[PDB]
Design a protein around this ligand. Structure first.
Ligand SMILES: CC(=O)N[C@H]1[C@H](O[C@H]2[C@@H](O)[C@@H](CO)O[C@@H](O[C@H]3[C@H](O)[C@@H](O)[C@H](O)O[C@@H]3CO)[C@@H]2O)O[C@H](CO)[C@@H](O[C@@H]2O[C@H](CO)[C@H](O)[C@H](O)[C@H]2O)[C@@H]1O[C@@H]1O[C@@H](C)[C@@H](O)[C@@H](O)[C@@H]1O
Ligand SMILES: [Cl-]
Ligand SMILES: [Cl-]
Ligand SMILES: [Cl-]
Length: 151
């Protein structure tokens, strides 16, 4: 069949805030396909505990490609409305006016992220992934599809 993923969302409006329909147990995949517009300075994928804006939902994993100068990906965590220490990845595959596929795999102690079929970064858990029930996608990005593979 054409469906290889679960709970697929097509062509969402950005900003997108959606409930993740099952638990992010080890081996679970979040697959996001899209493209970067020509004027993009940044976009982000936020794995959140809820969708509240007061207090702002904890962001277990903020995955934030940035496009100025040489480009990078910034990752961080928001706990009780405060950012932690940034982790910057300098070898970034994202480019303005290009399409991409992000695959986030949840492991026991970290996330692993591949982009366009290549391992890109790790991010150690700072909030237990059991607290994550919401997917936010924000900023200057066009999303074609979101899908899941729940373990
Ligand atoms: C200005 C901005 O884009 N704010 C974003 C916010 O970005 C921060 C995030 O990328 C962190 C990661 O560490 O870095 C911050 O900048 C650092 C900088 O990297 C560092 O060099 C310097 O020394 O310190 C800076 C400050 O710490 C970035 O500012 O990301 C969050 C989370 O995604 C955004 O909030 C979310 O926005 C969406 C809508 O896009 C939605 O509203 C969500 O509910 C919200 O959590 C934030 O967006 C801005 O602020 C929001 C509160 C809201 O007003 C948005 O409309 C606004 O664009
Ligand atoms: Cl913020
Ligand atoms: Cl692990
Ligand atoms: Cl937005």
């Amino acid at each position: 069949s054409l469906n290889n993923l679960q709970n697929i969302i097509y062509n969402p409006v950005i900003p997108f805030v959606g409930t993740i329909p099952d638990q992010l147990d080890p081996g679970t995949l979040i697959v996001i396909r899209g493209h970067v517009p020509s004027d993009a300075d940044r976009f982000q994928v936020d794995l959140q505990n809820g969708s509240s804006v007061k207090p702002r939902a904890d962001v277990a994993f903020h995955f934030n490609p940035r496009f100025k100068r040489a480009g990078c990906i910034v990752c961080n965590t928001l706990i009780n409305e405060k950012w932690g220490r940034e982790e910057i990845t300098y070898d970034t595959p994202f480019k303005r006016e290009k399409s991409f596929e992000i695959v986030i795999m949840v492991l026991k102690d970290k996330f692993q992220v591949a982009v366009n079929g290549k391992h890109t970064l790790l991010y150690g858990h700072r909030i237990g992934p059991e607290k994550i029930d919401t997917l936010g996608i924000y900023g200057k990005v066009n999303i074609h599809s979101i899908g899941f593979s729940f373990s």
